[PDB]
């Protein structure tokens, strides 16, 4: 574990002075020992991290998503969707079917890849939770490069999930898309 006992691991404690959960020992990556509401006892940390990792992945795609969709609309998509972003885009996309095709293909991936893998992991398998083998670029040969990498995938991905939320919530109460939102800092001058 990258920097075990330093950045992750037993010695660390997010809520120090509070005991590290009973089921939160060292091996799981991204374990600073933070399960305040004690889900660890009731949940399968396996499913848990399948979820965390999966979420963080779809959340990164999604965050970058929104940020880029506000700089460069693909022109064909742009013309069909009329410069509509985030919430409404989903509504209009869901019409052109863009969002319908995406649903079919991601669900097919899930039924082919996701569902079966989880079933195996929970039964018990060599595969780690979230361990699809996907690196065409086998970018990290080293186990060590890869530990730093897993920690970074979890954490970059958590900023991801917190921010996709911010993006969306801000968009509901204030009109602007995320690139737009920072500009026009106050955002209450115009509900846009």
């Amino acid at each position: 574990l990258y920097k075990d006992g330093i950045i992750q691991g037993l010695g660390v404690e997010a809520i120090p002075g509070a005991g590290r959960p009973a089921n939160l020992d060292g091996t799981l990556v991204g374990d600073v020992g933070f399960d305040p509401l004690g889900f660890s006892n009731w949940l399968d940390l396996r499913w848990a991290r399948e979820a965390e990792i999966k979420h963080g992945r779809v959340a990164m795609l999604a965050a970058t998503g929104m940020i880029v969709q506000d700089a460069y609309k693909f022109p064909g998509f742009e013309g069909e969707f009329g410069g509509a972003a985030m919430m409404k885009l989903h509504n209009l996309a869901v019409e052109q079917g863009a969002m319908q095709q995406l649903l079919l293909w991601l669900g097919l991936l899930e039924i082919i890849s996701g569902v079966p893998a989880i079933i195996q992991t929970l039964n018990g398998s060599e595969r780690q939770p979230g361990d699809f083998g996907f690196d065409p670029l086998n970018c990290g040969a080293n186990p060590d490069t890869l530990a730093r990498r897993q920690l970074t995938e979890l954490k970059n991905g958590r900023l991801a999930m917190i921010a996709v939320g911010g993006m969306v919530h801000h968009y509901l109460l204030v009109g602007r898309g995320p690139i737009e939102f920072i500009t026009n800092i106050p955002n209450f001058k115009n509900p846009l």
Partner: protein
């Protein structure tokens, strides 16, 4: 241990690797639930249907028989369900499929190989090595034609353009 086709998934047990075109691809795992020989026969039969269908789709577009009127492939089924021919074709397919049932009963008792009917009328793949390569080529081409026939027909519905036409003008 782990299927080469799906590395994160484990190798499906019944798919040892003896059958042609077996890359351990069975994510949902039907082989574990049913006889692999029956599934192999279904694969070969559907795929042979699809290979013939994919060829005929194009051969009809380039050339429709003069005694019959000229209709795009999909528009023809509705024509011949009345012309009469449709019945003749589906009739003969049923006739051959009754002996297909008999062959399936042989298959259940292990007296016949899956997707095998001793059809090498011209002794093409009579070499052991070749029959293997041909068996691999047959299963791939079948697996491809399964996709191709569906595309051809579904494209016609969404776009009234016999494939050759559509490809010509998108």
């Amino acid at each position: 241990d782990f299927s080469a086709a799906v590395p994160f998934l484990k190798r499906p047990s019944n798919l040892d690797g003896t059958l042609a075109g077996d890359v351990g691809f069975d994510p949902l795992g039907f082989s574990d639930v049913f006889d692999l020989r029956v599934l192999r026969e279904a694969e070969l039969k559907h795929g042979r249907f699809a290979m013939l269908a994919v060829l005929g789709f194009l051969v009809q577009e380039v050339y429709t028989f003069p005694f019959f009127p000229k209709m795009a492939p999909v528009d023809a089924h509705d024509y011949f369900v009345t012309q009469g021919g449709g019945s003749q074709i589906i009739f003969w397919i049923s006739f051959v499929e009754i002996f297909g049932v008999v062959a399936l009963f042989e298959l259940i008792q292990g007296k016949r190989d899956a997707g095998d009917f001793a059809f090498d009328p011209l002794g093409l793949g009579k070499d052991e090595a070749t029959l293997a390569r041909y068996k691999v080529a047959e299963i791939k081409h079948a697996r491809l034609a399964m996709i191709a026939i569906g595309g051809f027909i579904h494209q016609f519905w969404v776009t009234k353009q016999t494939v050759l036409e559509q490809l010509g003008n998108f």
